[PDB]
Amino acid sequence: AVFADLDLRAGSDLKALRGLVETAAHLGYSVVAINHIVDFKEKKQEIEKPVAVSELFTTLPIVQGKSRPIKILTRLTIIVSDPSHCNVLRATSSRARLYDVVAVFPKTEKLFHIACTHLDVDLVCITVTEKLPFYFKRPPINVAIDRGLAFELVYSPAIKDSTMRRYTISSALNLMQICKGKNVIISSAAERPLEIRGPYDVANLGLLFGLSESDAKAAVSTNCRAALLHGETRKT
Amino acid sequence: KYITASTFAQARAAEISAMLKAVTQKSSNSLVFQTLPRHMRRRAMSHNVKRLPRRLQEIAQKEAEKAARRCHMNRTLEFNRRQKKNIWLETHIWHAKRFHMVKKWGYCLGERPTVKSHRACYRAMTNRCLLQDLSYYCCLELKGKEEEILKALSGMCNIDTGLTFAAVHCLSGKRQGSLVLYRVNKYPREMLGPVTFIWKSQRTPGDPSESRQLWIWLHPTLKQDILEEIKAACQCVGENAKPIKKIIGDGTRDPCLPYSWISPTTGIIISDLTMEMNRFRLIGPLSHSILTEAIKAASVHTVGEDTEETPHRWWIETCKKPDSVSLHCRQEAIFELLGGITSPAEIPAGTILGLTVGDPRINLPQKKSKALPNPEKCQDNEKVRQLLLEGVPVECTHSFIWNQDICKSVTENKISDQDLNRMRSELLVPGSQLILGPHESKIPILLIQQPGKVTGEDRLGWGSGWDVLLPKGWGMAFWIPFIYRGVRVGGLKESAVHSQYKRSPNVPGDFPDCPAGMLFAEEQAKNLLEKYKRRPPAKRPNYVKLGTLAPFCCPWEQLTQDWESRVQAYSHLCVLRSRKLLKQLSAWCGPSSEDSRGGRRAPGRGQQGLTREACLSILGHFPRALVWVSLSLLSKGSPEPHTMICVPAKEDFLQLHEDWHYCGPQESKHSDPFRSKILKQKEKKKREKREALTLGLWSGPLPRVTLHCSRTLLGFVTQGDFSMAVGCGEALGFVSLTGLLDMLSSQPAAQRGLVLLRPPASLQYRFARIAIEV
Amino acid sequence: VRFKHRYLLCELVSDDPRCRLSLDDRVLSSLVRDTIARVHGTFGAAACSIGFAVRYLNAYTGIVLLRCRKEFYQLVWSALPFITYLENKGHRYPCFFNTLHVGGTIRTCQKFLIQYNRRQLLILLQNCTDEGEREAIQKSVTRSCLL
Amino acid sequence: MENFRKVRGGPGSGPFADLAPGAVHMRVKEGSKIRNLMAFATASMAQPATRAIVFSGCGRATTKTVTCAEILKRRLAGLHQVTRLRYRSVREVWQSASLSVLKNVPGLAILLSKDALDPRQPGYQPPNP
Amino acid sequence: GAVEAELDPVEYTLRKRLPSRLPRRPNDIYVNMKTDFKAQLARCQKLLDGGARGQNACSEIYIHGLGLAINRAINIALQLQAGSFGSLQVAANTSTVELVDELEPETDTREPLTRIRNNSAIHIRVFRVTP
RNA sequence: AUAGGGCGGAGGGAAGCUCAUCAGUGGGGCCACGAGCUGAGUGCGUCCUGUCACUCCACUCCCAUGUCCCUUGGGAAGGUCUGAGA
RNA sequence: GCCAGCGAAGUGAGUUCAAUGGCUGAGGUGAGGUACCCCGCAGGGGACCUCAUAACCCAAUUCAGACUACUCUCCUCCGCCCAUU
């Protein structure tokens, strides 16, 4: 019954990063991972010592729920637009074997097909902001659910913009008609020190996305548990 | 100072939220009448105010400003006429006033309380105190010479199988025994009945020449069976008075009953005493304290000095003997040592300790449910160890209520229970217990405890029950001092959870024998068939589609004939209650593990081995047998009565090894060709106007017992309920030997008692753990 | 002849504690009823206004108790993540956080507030490590035993 | 099966160090040592030493060091014993390759004394038979 | 006849009559064996945090146990210190529990030889010390 | 005669779906003992010497704080009277 | 006609600013259908698919009984009218 395992996209400074850890430790979170933005613009490879959370945090994550220490993981988010950049992921898989759970962000439906079948990742980043044309096809979804591949839905609609509220709820329901809810997680990015929600608050926010009446609670608990369970055998 | 100022707010957050929930429980919508505890609520508080306490009445007098015919008949003669039908015990006016009275095979007795106390009876049994009224257990006194009262009964108890009573020499003076009787020595394995047996002989003669007595404690379904067998085995020979005895017994007092005849050759005097004295089973850890504190021994030194005006001279002649005077002090000293004993779970096996008791309504505390813990003094360590190790009170065991003329004089005085209640209103004692004692009720009683779960090694002392034996005239007068100490009293349903959580079968009819169990199972079949025809269809689940003949527990006239037809083709209703063979059967089903050589431990201190040829020799030695099995569900199960035990397949063991918390497979439905004869019957019934076989009854039970269901069914469950002791579903029922040894031969490997069960209202197989604890 | 209610708890977890001093029942009723009209339309703005009322609020502590029906608890409990920008004289950014959705039954809703309060002061012992504040914790334990 | 055990009787053995007591140790599981340690525990009543006997035990030995100090109470009849309950880290390495794992077993230690605990016990509470 | 065939039931071990009084103002917990370990520490956590709900008030608990039980009764006490995280002083008291065994085969010529046996117990007492 | 279709009245100590997964919720239940308190065996010390060692030999593994079990709105709970829990 | 009570933990639901008859899927029974299978007496059974499963109403200490409000239903007793022989 490992509950409230979500991921954050957060690096600017150690003061803003530790504030999100202490806030997530306050609410319900027992597994908090930090994502890294890697794109085709700068083409940087910082894999070996990106943050070193265990060498900077003061050794005591304490929650007020189960009262257990937090397993802090390191995850990677690769923004892929061109198929020439997708071949970089197949080259760094044997050079540096870190970043236990790998998440990729596709943009083309031809590249989305090889991401669900041929590309060896763990989660799929699906964010549609400010008129991003990307339609969903049913055979690449039906292979990824049998493989065990998950799909992300990263939201932050409540603070920045009101126009961005509509693209997060409309692009979600285009996926709900096809995927049916076999492995769907809903994490949230946080740049400001207060851009996170409560542990039981996600259970209605998944029902706000629709998708279920009871299994939306399992989208933050059960489907998030399968990310570390499937990604552990990929590393070893 | 924000970290300091936040502490004052969070401290008051723990104060205000605690005071908002504590005052509101005492407020109850600002009402005085609902502030009372829920056990102490009466709905007649508005008609008469006298049903309220004194301190709560003063507020209700201020609330009164803001907010059928008479009966003049002799009620004693009314209840005398009503006693001609039933048996009508002395404590019937206590029980019928606050219990659901249901007429049964004998008389009407208390079964369920009017207040909901199902969780309260178990809670008053492992922690608090409890007591019952079990007076239907008859007794048979047998007076005769010592050489004749054993030769006529030696071929009835089967010495080499169960517990003996004849020459065991330890159950004689010290304690009682418990065993199962049978028929004559021709060895039929047909008729059987459990009897808690008592020996006592006089110590100072020490020879087989005096009068030797022994009692047969039995069940009223066996009262027609045992009394006609002992007769066949030994020798083929004004004022308003309270009818303390029976009217059925006194109406048959001249022709037949009580059966008190003598035998010419053997000298065996059969004394039938069905209702001669009453019995109360006192069960609990705190039941050992209220038996000690409320009951006080009779002062033999006060009366016997100079006061001699009135009879009870039978105790005066006892006080005249100086040996009985010093013996009564030893009987009280161990009885006062019982207050040092903390629980009746550690006292070896059914001890007997009788003494003389001055009646405990002399104290009669004013408060109700006045429960007290132990005193903080815990001295006399050497005196407690003397009784725990040896436990030989032969001098102190003096069952003085076994005399005929003395027990008559106990009842002959005919004391009034209401006139003594006026004595506290005449003397007007505010807080003292002052009763004048020139002549009191100095009559003895008997104290016998009973251990629970001796064969089962799970709890070892669950049911710790004392028995207070006493004559017929002292009924409710001895009942009422226990009520004001904190005792919650159950009934027959509480007498049913006494055995099913102790893993022993119930004594009326749940074990299948020939004269007794066939009459109660048919009576059990008449109650639920009336309930089955009471409910209209589309509300109950059908039984042809799901399972087999259920919840009617009589296919074992042909089920035990079928399991012998499966094996032998390639004396009836036998129960293997032989504890020498049950030690072997406990080794096969009980330990189900493998580390080096044996189950759950490598030394074992026993004999581990696989021999299938010796198992087939047991089946040819005892054909058509039936053995009870205690079984334990692992998770996600709830056993009902009359559920079927089914043999698992090879695919059931592979799925549970692959996945933990795996629910069992479902049941494929069966075809019902009997539906076409229903519209044939309904259209013929309406034709003849202008054999009742509707939805699960048919007289064709032969081919279904062979192979009907998907999984092969082998056993039933009689006591099906979820346990408050273990914490899960614990069923209790009966299987056959050939059903076990066919499953046990298939699995010499890992876990063996993992056997699925299927309730008849469902279609879901659920697995339990078979373990025979003998 | 009676209505089945639902009682949901909330907690303001934020820095700059002048926002916690600016709490009122008139502001909170004008905040929740407005943000339902911003997320949902005029349907949920009045379907969650016929039973909605405030009952329990401590500005120094930060626990919010709200009323809602059996048929309309899913609209209030889904509008809780979208509550930002509590506009006042200063610059404030609070955000509510649920603890446990209690189905009616005020008594055990206050019982969960006690066990949440007891777990907060025990963790606060070693993390703060102040001599003047530890004596104030001993004033909280002693007065709680007197209850 | 190679263990690595650290010692976390820490502050209390200060005044015990000035008396040089007789330490009694029970590692995990040894049956004949009960006949060996009680041979010296009976001898320590006869040999000239101070009233200070130090016991220890962890893992499964925490139920055997209680029985070891109980039999000596039937002979010496000590009136004060301090039973302290502290974490004890056991790092064993067993072969499946070599696998290392850290275990936190409970520990127990009984300090039989008679004279030195007269200014003591504000809240220590030794039993007095 | 203690070698070939004999029944050996163990009767009971006296604790005291105190668990009729001990669940009123304090709270007592008898740790058994072969039931569960995760359930027993959860029963220690709820009974320690029950204020005006459990029996009357949460003040202090302490734990009994016999010679097999004290291997795991010490395990629930030390994990409560890291669990409850507060200042909870642990004091233990050892004593002797008598144990009377009865063995009697189903034979006329035999008599039950009652053996003497003792077993070790502990009284791990958990305070509520103000930090 | 065909209780074939339609409708209505009276009566019963009539009855008012169950099961499986999952979730919510109020609770209840969740057993002081391994024939290890001079325990047994092995190799040394030693035949009187054991701050002797090893065997989860009785598996109880695990960052051990319940992924444990059962039950949770009726035949009339509704009124609204009579009677019982002294 | 008149006279008798106990503040003490914890109701196989036990709430008290007043919890709980949930969803999906598979059945039962009551209508309807078959290009499907088996048994061979034109017949019957099984398999599969569609649909009905309600109204009256709500525990507040509990139980027995009377009375009253009822229909997805089953049993008994009949009436009226239509049509048929």
Curated annotation (Swiss-Prot), chain A:
GO molecular function terms listed in the Swiss-Prot or TrEMBL record: ribonuclease P activity; ribonuclease P RNA binding; RNA binding
GO CC terms, sorted: multimeric ribonuclease P complex; nucleolar ribonuclease P complex; nucleoplasm; nucleus; ribonuclease MRP complex
Annotated GO biological process: rRNA processing; tRNA 5'-leader removal; tRNA processing
InterPro entries: Pol/histidinol_Pase-like (IPR016195), RNase_P_p30 (IPR002738)
Gene3D superfamilies: Metal-dependent hydrolases
Disulfide bonds: none
Compartments where located: Nucleus, Nucleolus
Keywords from the UniProt entry: Acetylation, Nucleus, Phosphoprotein, RNA-binding, rRNA processing, tRNA processing
Major place of residence: nucleus
Residues recorded as bearing N-acetylalanine in the entry: 1
Xref: Pfam families: RNase_P_p30
Additional observations: Autoantibodies against RPP30 are found in sera from scleroderma patients.
Function field: Component of ribonuclease P, a ribonucleoprotein complex that generates mature tRNA molecules by cleaving their 5'-ends. Also a component of the MRP ribonuclease complex, which cleaves pre-rRNA sequences.
Family from the record: Belongs to the eukaryotic/archaeal RNase P protein component 3 family.
Protein name: Ribonuclease P protein subunit p30
Gene transcribed to yield this protein: RPP30
From Swiss-Prot, chain B:
Swiss-Prot/TrEMBL GO biological process terms: tRNA 5'-leader removal; tRNA decay; tRNA processing
Alphabetic keyword roster: Disease variant, Dwarfism, Nucleus, Phosphoprotein, RNA-binding, tRNA processing
Record-given protein name: Ribonucleases P/MRP protein subunit POP1
GO cellular component term, pick one: nucleolus
Localization of this protein: Nucleus, Nucleolus
InterPro entries xrefs: Pop1 (IPR039182), POP1_C (IPR055079), Pop1_N (IPR009723), POPLD_dom (IPR012590)
Basic and acidic residues bias spans: 238-247
Start and end residues of each stretch annotated as Disordered: 589-608
Keyword Phosphoprotein annotated: yes
Superkingdom: Eukaryota
PANTHER family per UniProt: RIBONUCLEASES P/MRP PROTEIN SUBUNIT POP1, RIBONUCLEASES P_MRP PROTEIN SUBUNIT POP1
Residue stretches spanning the membrane: none
Biased composition (Basic residues): 681-690
GO molecular function terms noted in the UniProt entry: ribonuclease P activity; ribonuclease P RNA binding; RNA binding
Biological role: Component of ribonuclease P, a ribonucleoprotein complex that generates mature tRNA molecules by cleaving their 5'-ends. Also a component of the MRP ribonuclease complex, which cleaves pre-rRNA sequences.
Disease as annotated in the protein's UniProt record: Anauxetic dysplasia 2: An autosomal recessive spondyloepimetaphyseal dysplasia characterized by severe short stature of prenatal onset, very short adult height (less than 1 meter), hypodontia, midface hypoplasia, and mild intellectual disability.
Residue positions, PTM Phosphoserine: 432
UniProtKB/Swiss-Prot annotation, chain C:
Gene3D superfamilies (alphabetical): Ribonuclease P, Pop5 subunit (3.30.70.3250)
InterPro entries in the record: Pop5/Rpp14/Rnp2-like, RNase_P/MRP_POP5, Rnp2-like_sf
Keyword terms of this UniProt record: Nucleus, Phosphoprotein, RNA-binding, rRNA processing, tRNA processing
Chief location category: nucleus
Entry annotated with the keyword Nucleus: yes
GO cellular component: multimeric ribonuclease P complex; nucleolar ribonuclease P complex; nucleolus; nucleoplasm; ribonuclease MRP complex
Subcellular location: Nucleus, Nucleolus
GO biological process: rRNA processing; tRNA 5'-leader removal
Any one GO molecular function term: ribonuclease P activity
PANTHER family the record matches: POP5 HOMOLOG, RIBONUCLEASE P_MRP SUBUNIT
Misc note: The last C-terminal 19 amino acids are not required for complex association and RNase activity.
Chain's role: Component of ribonuclease P, a protein complex that generates mature tRNA molecules by cleaving their 5'-ends. Also a component of the MRP ribonuclease complex, which cleaves pre-rRNA sequences.
Family designation: Belongs to the eukaryotic/archaeal RNase P protein component 2 family.
Name under which the protein is recorded: Ribonuclease P/MRP protein subunit POP5
Organism: Homo sapiens
Source taxonomy: Eukaryota, Metazoa, Chordata, Craniata, Vertebrata
The encoding gene: POP5
UniProtKB/Swiss-Prot annotation, chain D:
Cellular component GO terms held in the UniProt record: centriolar satellite; multimeric ribonuclease P complex; nucleolus; nucleoplasm; ribonuclease MRP complex
Single GO BP term: tRNA 5'-leader removal
Biased composition annotated in UniProt, kind: Basic and acidic residues: 1-8
Domain of life the protein comes from: Eukaryota
Keyword rRNA processing recorded: yes
Subcellular localization(s) per the UniProt record: Nucleus, Nucleolus
Main location: nucleus
Keyword Acyltransferase: no
Alphabetical UniProt keywords: Nucleus, Phosphoprotein, RNA-binding, rRNA processing, tRNA processing
Molecular function GO terms recorded: ribonuclease P activity; ribonuclease P RNA binding; RNA binding
Family, as annotated: Belongs to the histone-like Alba family.
General function of this protein: Component of ribonuclease P, a ribonucleoprotein complex that generates mature tRNA molecules by cleaving their 5'-ends. Also a component of the MRP ribonuclease complex, which cleaves pre-rRNA sequences.
Assembly and binders: Component of nuclear RNase P and RNase MRP ribonucleoproteins. RNase P consists of a catalytic RNA moiety and 10 different protein chains; POP1, POP4, POP5, POP7, RPP14, RPP21, RPP25, RPP30, RPP38 and RPP40. Within the RNase P complex, POP1, POP7 and RPP25 form the 'finger' subcomplex, POP5, RPP14, RPP40 and homodimeric RPP30 form the 'palm' subcomplex, and RPP21, POP4 and RPP38 form the 'wrist' subcomplex. All subunits of the RNase P complex interact with the catalytic RNA. Several subunits of RNase P are also part of the RNase MRP complex.
Protein name in UniProt: Ribonuclease P protein subunit p25
Organism: Homo sapiens (Human)
Interval of the full protein contained in this chain: 1 to 156 of 199
